[PDB]
Motif scaffolding. Structure first.
Motif, PDB file in Angstrom:
ATOM      1  N   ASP A 159       0.482  -1.150   0.099  1.00 25.60           N
ATOM      2  CA  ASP A 159       0.004  -0.089  -0.231  1.00 25.60           C
ATOM      3  C   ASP A 159       0.727   1.253  -0.297  1.00 25.60           C
ATOM      4  OD1 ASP A 159       0.572  -0.518   2.878  1.00 25.60           O
ATOM      5  OD2 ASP A 159      -1.127   0.168   3.773  1.00 25.60           O
ATOM      6  N   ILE A 191      -5.593   2.543  -2.735  1.00 23.76           N
ATOM      7  CA  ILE A 191      -5.222   2.060  -1.781  1.00 23.76           C
ATOM      8  C   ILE A 191      -3.536   1.714  -2.236  1.00 23.76           C
ATOM      9  CG2 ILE A 191      -4.392  -0.117   0.048  1.00 23.76           C
ATOM     10  CD1 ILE A 191      -8.282   0.630   0.414  1.00 23.76           C
ATOM     11  N   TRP A 192      -3.779   0.788  -3.317  1.00 30.70           N
ATOM     12  CA  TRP A 192      -2.695  -0.178  -4.147  1.00 30.70           C
ATOM     13  C   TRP A 192      -1.430   0.541  -4.805  1.00 30.70           C
ATOM     14  CZ3 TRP A 192      -2.228  -3.422  -0.065  1.00 30.70           C
ATOM     15  CH2 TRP A 192      -3.228  -4.388   0.171  1.00 30.70           C
ATOM     16  N   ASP A 243      -1.554   4.032  -5.446  1.00 32.67           N
ATOM     17  CA  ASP A 243      -1.536   5.483  -4.850  1.00 32.67           C
ATOM     18  C   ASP A 243      -0.822   5.301  -3.588  1.00 32.67           C
ATOM     19  OD1 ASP A 243      -1.836   8.380  -5.132  1.00 32.67           O
ATOM     20  OD2 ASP A 243      -3.304   8.806  -3.389  1.00 32.67           O
ATOM     21  N   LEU A 244       0.412   6.510  -3.748  1.00 31.73           N
ATOM     22  CA  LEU A 244       1.417   6.671  -2.917  1.00 31.73           C
ATOM     23  C   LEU A 244       0.390   7.050  -1.226  1.00 31.73           C
ATOM     24  CD1 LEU A 244       4.843   7.074  -3.947  1.00 31.73           C
ATOM     25  CD2 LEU A 244       3.305   4.888  -3.663  1.00 31.73           C
ATOM     26  N   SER A 271      -2.088   7.126  -0.572  1.00 33.53           N
ATOM     27  CA  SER A 271      -3.829   6.417   0.117  1.00 33.53           C
ATOM     28  C   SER A 271      -3.247   5.145   0.773  1.00 33.53           C
ATOM     29  CB  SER A 271      -4.665   6.495  -0.555  1.00 33.53           C
ATOM     30  OG  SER A 271      -4.982   7.133  -1.710  1.00 33.53           O
TER      31      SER A 271
HETATM   32 MG   LIG Z   1      -0.468   3.121  -1.397  1.00 34.35          MG
END
Ligand SMILES: [Mg+2]
Ligand SMILES: *[C@@](C)(CO)[C@](*)(O)[C@H](CC(C)C)NC(=O)[C@H](Cc1ccccc1)NC(=O)[C@H](CC(C)C)NC(=O)[C@H](CCc1ccccc1)NC(=O)CN1CCOCC1
Ligand SMILES: *[C@@](C)(CO)[C@](*)(O)[C@H](CC(C)C)NC(=O)[C@H](Cc1ccccc1)NC(=O)[C@H](CC(C)C)NC(=O)[C@H](CCc1ccccc1)NC(=O)CN1CCOCC1
Ligand SMILES: *[C@@](C)(CO)[C@](*)(O)[C@H](CC(C)C)NC(=O)[C@H](Cc1ccccc1)NC(=O)[C@H](CC(C)C)NC(=O)[C@H](CCc1ccccc1)NC(=O)CN1CCOCC1
Ligand SMILES: [Cl-]
Ligand SMILES: [Mg+2]
Lengths: 196, 230, 222, 212, 195, 222, 125, 204, 195
Positions: C222, F163-164, F166-167, F169
């Motif tokens: 994440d 989530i995965w 984007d840094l 999120s």
């Molecule tokens: Mg992320």
């Protein structure tokens, strides 16, 4: 944005694309840029989304209060209220608005209001970034006292070209017909207008 | 020191079990003006490599010429130019990566983002990225510009890591790429409907598809949307 | 105006033992808020039992590693296949970096290996060529998170012998390869939790007299 | 940084801290800021780490080449002038150095030269260089006499660095001592400020500002 | 303005302040007293921007003197220092802030203890055994760290102060034309004429 | 942040990740970005954290007073109008980017508001740094006439994309379902796909490790 | 530039151009150097086929290189000026960088090095 | 001229089994010059503890302001303010100065006297609340403290064990920051006793 | 660097130059000699940018000494000053100019007259009875206008010079740690040790 309003035999028609952008990202591809300030007085919005919305909301409030006291306002009156806001707050606004309405006495009328806040009454008007690409086309093809079907085709073909060349314009082509008969909403999708 | 004038947008790509797929639209933008519509931004090198280029088009055409000249130069005094000593994807990439970094180091960059997709002689899939800064990286999926933000998320749902590559067929992979191109047309203001797609397979070889269009679009829900609030 | 530098994120970590040395680094590669690759190695075996990593701007990092690898090759050609010692490698790298003093490589460089007495060695460099041998060094984006933890756990800083009235310090001792890898894995899981540019995977390179071994571990994505 | 060196009856004392910083980040506490050029010559380092490190190491190579060519150890004046002429060629390019070239020779005796990156070169008896130079000056000047013993001189140098290490945020780690005699330089150990501060506070009765 | 020092010893507070007033390339005056008596057992020295310094000092002096008349009572050094800090703390977010740094030396008659407060133009207050403002601290603090003891006499404090002025006169770039020294103790405020 | 909103058969659903950042540092690993304006009108906020919380509480307060004054359940368009006029007045200096959703006597509604005071209507929306990752998923899988369970799945999948990829999120997925005729159900930590793995070592120190100078009992009582 | 190798080896292992330069020295007026316990003396011959000379202005045979070193010579007069000039410049350059005048050995070593360079450089004799 | 890093300093807070701990350094400087080694950054109002890092003048001003407000609270409410309530008061007060803010990084710590639940919270300079089960950090060495706390912390630590963990977190973080250090104070807080300990640390 | 003065009298030229070398807030040295002997009867004082000053002075010194050896003859002060001016005149249009101001005091043995030349970093030369560089002139010129006479002795010139240093020590902001005085006459160059 690409927006336009065109007077014709039975009244006036407003037209617009549906694209809203943040830089090169399309924040909304199904935007409604044709908005009601009174029963049969509408406007096309270009420039800042926030500024034009705030202005249109205030104008709607002014015309509603006008109607409560003095009855139905003229299209000229509506344009004057738009002007007053745009001119007096020219330093803090980025709004290019076209005002269009249908009276029974005055029939279809179109007023355009650029950045400065000046008012210009015209047979038809074009505005927004994408309008630059269709000045040549619209001038050559516009005729006074067109029919409804002819005016719809004129707007559809015009905005089709504006959309084709302007990256800041696209999505669907919304239209709003203002006549004695009433208010009609029209929509036209890419699959139709792209291959015109 | 440069500024890009005529530009090309996203290039997207991914690996699958037997090879690699790559795609890019046919637009040459002049700022907000969608100036040129017949621009090919995928350039094949031999029958085993495709170079996809985004960014400045004048610099893209320069790179085309360099690759064209590289093929000519490799054929000189080379009896095995169409066999063992043919140009590999890894050779073509390293050459471009060298050039890009040398140009940034002279403060006069080629204003591009480049993805080299292909298949090696031993059958291995090759997919690597390089840009104006000389920055290089590899991944099961790669994309440039808006593709990086919108395509990669969609393509990573198909191939999330290395072990997902053998499990991914060419039918499934192409479907994802074509879908990603549709999404980019919805959301990228400097994209077009027309695009090109290329498949490099270790068995069936190079398949170059021109004049594709984004289709099966959802626009009908727009008619129900009225105003901006009230 | 064109900006010739960029930030590719990630973080690296080197620890030295009695008869070994480890050089770890995460495999994530980023630009701004996007992930470029979940597995892009930046720790490299350069030959002569020297492992190297140059973290920061990846284009400069790759260029430097490439030049040092090439420096090792020419050292063999020019000096009868002589083994390049870790101390000699360190001095050579200083000249590589300082050669671009007025247009620097934008990287934190760490090398690891064994010294000429067989004992574990870690050297660390600033972007322009200053260097120093240490038992311990973290570098890159999460260096400020990891480094103080290492001071406490590797060099036993701020730790005193219980009951001695804070008069006797906890004695220094070498750590086993098992104990060191535990610290590395914990350092990176902690860094992954609190730093956005760190994650995806961890790749450790261990260096003993027998050669260069590798170990890989998953990190949060994440 | 804080570095000093002073001349006295029994030769030259040289004392330095060991901290390195990148802004407010303490990057190292164990940096060697004295470079051993030969058995009779020392160089101190303040300013940009690499600039000092690189060019003073290079200075040692030039001094070695002098004694090979001339069959005689280089003078402190000549050694300092090689460094000063070098940095003057780079004047304006952005080098950052505050160095002190210390040593003994027969013709000169004990000698200290201040050399910096804008080309200044000064012979003198006392110098303090670095971000914490003023703190070191305060203690050193107020306690300095020419007739100090070797034991007392070593302590004053140590105590002056400690004073600066305490007050200056960008100085600290540990103190490195050196004594330069007619016979050459002698290393007098690494002294961690962690233990040294409390030891000095208790024994000397100073540092009453600090909570004991 | 430039050099202001302060030392708290066993039974008194000693303030030393430079005599020079410079503007451009000219020393206009070499006998300037950079201090005001706020109350019989409270003294404030000051340094900073031209005009602001005296305007601020006299404004504080007026307010403390007003308080004394109203209540027929002398405010404690601690109370005066808090009042001064709050005024500077207000000032820093004004249209045009007072650019003045002060030292407040006083003798608390209720506690029978000397007290020294250092307050900068931002309104940052600290009670200290010895204090300084501006570049002076970069020399004097380390010197006092070494030589200062808490149980010193007034005479020992003056010798300690001579040591500070000598160091400043040796290593400071500018000629500050010596200092005016004043002592605050149980018997009030007095000036040392021969320094 | 990543935040989304999706309309379905008999109402509307909104979702959000649970990462709070301070530059590249993760300040809060499980913060609540779903705010209650009124019982059946909820808000998802991206941008300046203090501004989103403050603007949501102010309008929520004024909505409650309005609801009591009119003896009516509050409408989404009222919250929308009050928010946009407040934000417009401050010319974008209040950095609140909101997705407003809820049910009222008029029906179910879904809007977004930007810091400068512009509003948008839609069936599916996304805001925040991970809005492009989310919108990619929404554009791929959204259809007309979604069920409750289909909309929750689509919404959480759009957040997961953020989530995965984007840094900005990370961590968990919060959800709030607002169906017509029913109470709104707030599903705090609806998904927790980022659990911290067991640490390799316990860092419990022997008692007495830290050197102490003074002890003293503190008086909290009167 | 004129590149010709003028000084080269011959079959017997001699460099004739260097050896013919020694013949020019043998033609030159005699010069002698004698060093005592606390001094050195340089003596020089001046040929007497030249009357009506002006000895005030005529170049002297002994030249000061610095205030503490002197140089006399035998051979081509014009050639000697070039060596003397170089030596004088190097003397001042040494004082500038080393902060000490040249030793006699150092100054000699420099002049000798110049002479050597002209024995294996192209285009020069 | 960056208000939050002129004076320097750090604060950290942690939770344990039926207890909380809050700790701070003692340095007050003017950029490179160390000025005072007695400048405590932790204050308390009844049983609620507040630590404040950042610009020292604002630290002092806010302490005086919250003492002011909590005193009036107690007079009118006829009870001590609780940590959850005080947290909201801090947030309100900071956001009141939205476009002219206090340059501070406050940290609340305390045990609710009714429920007995340990509570900590952190804020940014304009009032955003940051609640946490485990730990809160603040100051010029916040990056260092984040790294120390994330690795050293475990849940449900006994008061004696928790003291060791928080102290080591602060000390080792302070030693990697130039503007922090010069002494340290730790507060251990149980339901109805509070122990305050001064730590021995390096004075450079 | 800062203060350099020069006075030409009947039979000699007197140069006074400050002893302080300051960098930042520290006086690094208080015994610096800001002069070089170019020839037995020619002296040059200098002031300006750090590093440039000494580098330039020694470069000129080397060139004049080279000339003396080559010709076995001492250049006249006028000839030396012209050489110096041309070097500075070249420098000002270089990539990095020498930022150095000089005074050249000499005794012409052929004319039996003392000569004082003032040259700034641009290469602006003037022969003067008395000269100064930097802020010093703003005090000394008006003072010398009043007290200077052309027929003064060396002793009268030193008293006149004491008057200048006293004025500078009274009104200059910075502490320049006194001056080193040197006299140039028919017998060459010598230093006054007690000033
Ligand atoms: Mg992320
Ligand atoms: C066409 C596109 C051009 O004429 C039309 O005129 C439409 C009009 C419709 C929507 C009524 N115009 C836009 O879509 C308009 C283009 C624009 C942008 C900036 C200034 C003026 C006009 N877009 C917007 O107003 C968007 C709408 C948001 C995304 C919902 N707003 C922004 O882009 C905001 C506006 C900030 C602003 C600037 C100047 C005056 C008023 C408002 N800008 C950002 O969020 C900045 N963003 C930050 C990250 O970096 C990229 C830029
Ligand atoms: C006292 C302790 C402080 O002044 C001394 O003066 C010491 C002298 C010793 C080390 C010989 N000086 C320093 O520690 C010196 C201070 C300094 C910094 C920068 C310019 C001038 C003076 N510190 C350094 O030189 C550090 C040493 C590193 C930490 C080992 N190096 C850097 O700051 C480098 C290189 C700086 C630089 C100079 C010239 C051109 C380009 C760069 N910079 C970085 O490492 C960048 N930074 C590290 C943190 O992560 C983000 C990138
Ligand atoms: C995703 C994560 C990013 O878009 C989301 O949008 C979230 C929104 C949720 C949490 C509501 N955004 C953030 O977490 C947001 C990112 C951000 C940062 C700065 C400007 C805009 C957006 N983070 C914050 O707002 C944090 C909240 C913390 C963790 C409590 N606040 C800060 O980082 C503040 C910013 C305050 C600010 C003041 C004036 C104008 C704009 C912002 N910054 C600091 O505290 C930094 N600094 C520390 C030293 O003391 C001085 C302040
Ligand atoms: Cl809109
Ligand atoms: Mg310190």
């Amino acid at each position: 944005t690409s927006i336009m309003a065109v007077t014709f035999k039975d009244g006036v028609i407003l037209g617009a694309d549906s694209r809203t952008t943040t830089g090169a990202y399309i924040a909304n591809r199904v935007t409604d840029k044709l908005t009601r300030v009174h029963d049969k007085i509408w406007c096309c919005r270009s420039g800042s989304a926030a500024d034009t919305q705030a202005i249109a909301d205030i104008v709607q409030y002014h015309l509603e209060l006008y109607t409560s006291q003095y009855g139905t306002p003229s299209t000229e009156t509506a344009a004057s209220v738009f002007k007053e806001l745009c001119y007096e707050n020219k330093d803090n606004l980025t709004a290019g608005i076209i005002v269009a309405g249908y009276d029974d006495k005055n029939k279809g009328e179109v007023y355009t209001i650029p950045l400065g806040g000046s008012v210009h009454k015209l047979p038809y008007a074009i505005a927004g970034s994408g309008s630059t690409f269709i000045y040549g086309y619209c001038d050559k093809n516009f005729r006074e006292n067109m029919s409804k079907e002819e005016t719809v085709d004129f707007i559809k073909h015009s905005l089709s070209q504006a959309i084709k060349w302007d990256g800041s314009s696209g999505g669907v082509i919304r239209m709003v017909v203002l006549t004695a008969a009433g208010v009609e909403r029209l929509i036209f999708y890419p699959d139709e207008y792209e291959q015109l | 020191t440069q500024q890009p004038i005529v530009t090309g947008t996203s290039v997207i790509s991914m690996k699958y079990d037997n090879g690699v797929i790559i795609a890019a639209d046919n637009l040459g933008s002049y700022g907000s003006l969608l100036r040129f519509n017949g621009v090919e931004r995928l350039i094949p090198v031999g029958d085993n490599t495709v170079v996809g280029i985004s960014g400045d088009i004048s610099d893209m055409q320069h790179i085309e010429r360099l690759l064209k000249d590289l093929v000519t130069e490799n054929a000189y005094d080379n009896p095995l130019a169409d066999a063992e000593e043919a140009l590999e994807p890894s050779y073509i990439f390293e050459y471009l990566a060298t050039v890009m970094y040398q140009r940034r180091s002279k403060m006069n960059p080629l204003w591009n983002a480049i993805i080299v997709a292909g298949v090696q002689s031993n059958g291995d899939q090759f997919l690597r990225y390089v840009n104006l800064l000389g920055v290089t990286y590899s991944s099961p999926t790669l994309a440039t510009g808006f593709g990086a933000h919108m395509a990669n998320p969609l393509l990573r749902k198909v191939v999330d890591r290395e072990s997902d590559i053998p499990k991914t067929t060419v039918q499934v992979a192409e479907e994802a790429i074509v879908n990603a191109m549709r999404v980019l047309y919805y959301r990228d203001a400097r994209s077009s409907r027309n695009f090109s797609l290329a498949i490099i397979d270790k068995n069936t070889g190079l398949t170059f598809k021109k004049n594709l269009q984004v289709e099966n679009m959802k626009w009908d829900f727009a008619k129900d949307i009225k105003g901006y609030g009230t | 105006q064109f900006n010739p530098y960029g930030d590719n994120g990630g973080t690296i970590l080197g620890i030295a033992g009695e008869d070994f040395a480890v050089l770890a680094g995460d495999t994530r590669n980023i630009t701004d808020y996007s992930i470029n690759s979940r597995y892009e190695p930046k720790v490299f075996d350069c030959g002569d039992n020297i492992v190297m990593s140059a973290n920061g701007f990846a284009a400069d990092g790759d260029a430097l590693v490439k030049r040092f690898k090439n420096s090792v090759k020419w050292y063999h050609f020019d000096h009868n296949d002589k083994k390049l010692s870790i101390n000699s490698a360190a001095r050579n790298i200083q000249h590589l970096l300082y050669g671009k003093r007025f247009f620097p490589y934008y990287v934190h460089t760490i090398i690891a290996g064994l010294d000429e007495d067989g004992k574990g060695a870690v050297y660390s460099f600033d972007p322009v060529g200053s260097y120093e041998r240490e038992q311990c060094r973290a570098g890159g984006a999460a260096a400020s998170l990891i480094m103080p933890f290492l001071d406490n756990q590797v060099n036993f800083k701020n730790q005193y012998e219980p009951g001695t009235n804070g008069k006797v310090k906890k004695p220094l001792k070498y750590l086993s390869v098992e104990e060191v890898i535990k610290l590395v894995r914990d350092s990176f899981t902690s860094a992954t939790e609190r730093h956005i540019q760190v994650g995806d995977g961890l790749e450790i390179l261990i260096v003993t007299k027998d050669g260069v071994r590798k170990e890989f571990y998953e990190l949060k994505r994440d | 940084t804080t570095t000093l060196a002073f001349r006295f009856q029994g030769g030259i004392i040289v004392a330095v801290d060991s901290r390195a910083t990148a802004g407010n980040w303490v990057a190292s506490q164990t940096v060697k800021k004295v470079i051993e050029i030969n058995p009779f010559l020392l160089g101190t380092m303040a300013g940009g780490t690499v600039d000092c490190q690189f060019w003073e190491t290079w200075l040692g190579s030039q001094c070695r080449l002098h004694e090979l060519r001339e069959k005689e150890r280089i003078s402190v004046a000549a050694a300092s002038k090689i460094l000063s002429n070098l940095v003057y060629q780079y004047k304006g390019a952005g080098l950052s150095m505050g160095t002190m070239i210390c040593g003994y020779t027969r013709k000169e005796g004990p000698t200290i030269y201040y050399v910096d990156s804008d080309g200044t070169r000064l012979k003198g008896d006392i110098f303090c260089v670095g971000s914490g130079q003023t703190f070191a000056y305060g203690v050193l000047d107020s306690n300095y006499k020419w007739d100090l013993s070797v034991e007392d001189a070593l302590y004053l140098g140590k105590r002056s660095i400690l004073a600066a290490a305490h007050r200056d945020a960008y100085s600290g780690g540990s103190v490195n001592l050196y004594h330069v005699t007619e016979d050459g330089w002698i290393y007098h150990g690494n002294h961690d400020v962690g233990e040294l501060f409390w030891k000095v506070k208790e024994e000397e009765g100073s540092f009453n500002n600090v909570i004991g | 303005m430039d050099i202001i020092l302060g030392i708290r010893v066993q039974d008194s507070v000693i303030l030393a302040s430079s005599k020079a007033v410079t503007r451009g390339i000219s020393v206009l005056k070499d006998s300037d007293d950079k201090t005001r008596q706020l109350s019989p057992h409270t003294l404030m020295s000051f340094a900073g921007e031209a005009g602001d310094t005296v305007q601020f000092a006299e404004y504080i002096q007026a307010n403390i003197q007003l308080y004394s008349i109203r209540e027929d009572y002398e405010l404690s050094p601690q109370a005066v220092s808090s009042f001064v800090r709050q005024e500077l703390a207000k000032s820093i977010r004004s249209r045009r802030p007072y650019q003045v740094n002060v030292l407040i030396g006083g003798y608390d008659k209720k506690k029978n203890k000397p007290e020294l407060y250092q307050i900068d133009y931002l309104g940052t207050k600290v009670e200290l055994p010895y204090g300084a403002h501006g570049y002076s601290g970069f020399y004097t603090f380390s010197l006092l760290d070494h030589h200062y003891r808490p149980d010193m006499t007034t005479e020992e404090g003056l010798d300690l102060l001579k040591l500070c002025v000598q160091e400043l006169e040796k290593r400071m770039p500018m000629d500050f034309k010596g200092v005016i020294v004043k002592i605050v103790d149980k018997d009030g405020i007095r000036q040392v004429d021969d320094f | 942040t990543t935040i989304v909103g999706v309309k379905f058969n008999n109402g509307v659903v909104i979702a959000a990740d649970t990462r709070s950042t301070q530059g590249p540092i993760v300040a809060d690993k499980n913060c609540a970005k779903l705010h209650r304006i009124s019982p059946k009108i909820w808000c998802a906020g991206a941008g300046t954290a203090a501004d989103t919380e403050a603007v949501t509480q102010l309008i929520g307060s004024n909505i409650e007073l309005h609801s009591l004054y009119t003896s009516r359940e509050p409408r989404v368009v009222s919250a929308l109008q009050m928010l946009k006029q407040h934000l417009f007045k401050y010319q974008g200096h209040i950095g609140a980017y909101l997705i407003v959703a809820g049910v009222d006597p008029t029906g179910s509604h879904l809007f977004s508001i930007h810091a400068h005071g512009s509003t948008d209507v839609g069936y599916y929306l996304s805001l925040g740094s991970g809005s492009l990752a989310a919108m990619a998923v929404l554009e791929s899988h959204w259809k007309q006439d979604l069920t409750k369970e289909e909309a929750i799945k689509l919404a959480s999948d759009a957040i997961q994309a953020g989530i995965w990829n984007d840094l900005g999120s990370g961590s968990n997925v919060d959800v709030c379902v607002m169906e017509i005729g029913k109470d709104a159900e707030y599903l705090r930590n609806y998904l927790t796909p980022n659990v911290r793995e067991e640490k390799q070592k316990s860092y419990k120190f022997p008692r007495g490790t830290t050197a102490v100078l003074k002890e003293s009992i503190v008086n909290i009582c009167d | 530039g004129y590149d010709r190798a003028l000084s080269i080896f011959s079959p017997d292992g001699h460099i004739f151009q260097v050896e013919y330069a020694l013949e020019a020295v043998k033609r030159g007026t005699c010069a002698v150097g004698v060093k005592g316990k606390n001094c050195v003396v340089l003596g020089c011959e001046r040929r007497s086929t030249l009357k009506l000379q002006d000895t005030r202005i005529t170049p002297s045979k002994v030249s000061k290189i610095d205030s503490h070193v002197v140089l006399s010579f035998s051979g081509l007069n014009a050639d000697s000026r070039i060596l003397i000039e170089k030596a004088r410049v190097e003397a001042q350059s040494h004082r500038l960088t080393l902060e000490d005048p040249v030793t006699v050995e150092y100054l000699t070593r420099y002049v000798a090095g110049v002479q050597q360079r002209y024995t294996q450089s192209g285009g020069v004799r | 001229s960056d208000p939050s890093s002129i004076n320097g300093g750090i604060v950290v807070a942690m939770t344990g089994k039926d207890c909380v701990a809050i700790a701070c350094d003692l340095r007050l400087g003017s950029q490179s010059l160390g000025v005072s080694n007695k400048f405590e950054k932790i204050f308390h109002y009844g049983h609620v503890f507040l630590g404040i890092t950042g610009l020292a003048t604002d630290v002092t001003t806010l302490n005086e302001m919250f003492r002011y407000k909590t005193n009036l609270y107690k007079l009118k409410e006829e009870r001590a303010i609780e940590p959850e309530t005080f947290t909201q008061l801090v947030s309100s007060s900071l956001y009141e100065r939205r476009f002219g803010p206090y340059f501070v990084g406050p940290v609340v710590a305390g045990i609710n006297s009714k429920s007995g639940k340990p509570f900590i919270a952190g804020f940014d300079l304009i009032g955003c609340i940051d609640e946490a089960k485990d730990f809160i950090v603040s100051g010029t060495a916040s990056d260092q403290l984040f790294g120390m706390c994330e690795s050293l912390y475990e849940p449900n630590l006994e008061p004696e064990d928790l003291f060791e963990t928080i102290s080591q977190a602060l000390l080792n973080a302070a030693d990697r920051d130039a503007l922090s250090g010069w002494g340290a104070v730790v507060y251990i807080i149980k339901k109805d006793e509070v122990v305050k300990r001064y730590l021995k640390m390096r004075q450079d």
